[PDB]
Amino acid sequence: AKTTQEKFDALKEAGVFSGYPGTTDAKLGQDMTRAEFAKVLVKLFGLKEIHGQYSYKDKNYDAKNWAAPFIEAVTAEGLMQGKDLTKKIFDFNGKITVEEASKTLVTALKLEPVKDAQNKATDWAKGYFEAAVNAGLFSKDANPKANATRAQLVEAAFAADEMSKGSGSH
Numbered sequence: 001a002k003t004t005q006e007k008f009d010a011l012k013e014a015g016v017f018s019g020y021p022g023t024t025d026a027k028l029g030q031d032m033t034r035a036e037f038a039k040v041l042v043k044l045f046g047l048k049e050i051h052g053q054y055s056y057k058d059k060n061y062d063a064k065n066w067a068a069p070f071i072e073a074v075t076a077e078g079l080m081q082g083k084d085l086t087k088k089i090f091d092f093n094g095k096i097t098v099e100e101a102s103k104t105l106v107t108a109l110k111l112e113p114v115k116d117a118q119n120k121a122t123d124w125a126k127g128y129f130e131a132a133v134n135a136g137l138f139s140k141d142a143n144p145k146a147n148a149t150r151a152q153l154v155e156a157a158f159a160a161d162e163m164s165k166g167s168g169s170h
């Protein structure tokens with residue numbers, strides 16, 4: 001048995017999770033930006049950062065945005081595509097939701113989204129969330145449309161790491 005705090009400490013020592021911005025603290029009750037979670041995914045699945053490329057037209061998405069190399073990496077990997085393919089908006093300052101997190105992890109772990117899933121997720125995420133719940137990445141009782149707490153994300157990331165180790169191709 002490991003606590004959420006212990007799982008954070010482990011992932012932090014591994015360079016996967018950082019403290020809540022402005023702190024080095026777990027702050028398990030707080031939310032996380034899509035920018036921060038992009039970095040988490042890059043560190044968790046050992047993706048290569050992509051510098052000098054910008055695939056999004058978000059305000060202040062440029063060379064001066066620390067998150068750009070991570071957002072570009074998850075985009076190239078096919079984990080995240082942003083919220084609007086017309087306007088090319090990632091929403092890097094937006095909070096990562098349980099169902100958004102579910103998609104990234106289900107895609108990274110190569111799990112099959114469940115066809116004709118019945119749950120409270122947004123239509124696009126129904127299969128991704130169902131697959132995430134079935135794999136034990138999130139609880140059945142998690143709100144897919146809710147901002148994921150750092151606790152939920154720590155538990156999800158740790159579970160995804162264990163699944164990667166166990167698969168034979170970490």
Ligand SMILES: CO[C@@H]1O[C@@H]2CO[C@](C)(C(=O)O)O[C@H]2[C@H](O[C@@H]2O[C@H](CO)[C@@H](O[C@@H]3O[C@@H]4CO[C@](C)(C(=O)O)O[C@H]4[C@H](O)[C@@H]3NC(C)=O)[C@H](O)[C@H]2NC(C)=O)[C@@H]1NC(C)=O
Binds near residue numbers: 083100101122
């Ligand atoms: C900017 O305002 C818009 O207004 C729209 C009005 O019409 C509808 C149909 C509506 O709901 O009535 O859609 C509104 C827009 O909602 C968004 O519609 C987008 C296009 O389908 C949805 O995009 C998803 O965004 C995920 C992001 O995170 C990841 C992990 C990612 O790839 O970055 O997954 C992504 C999935 O693939 C999806 N991506 C794509 C490209 O379809 C967003 O999840 C969805 N937001 C919500 C709260 O439901 C949106 N409103 C809001 C509150 O965001």
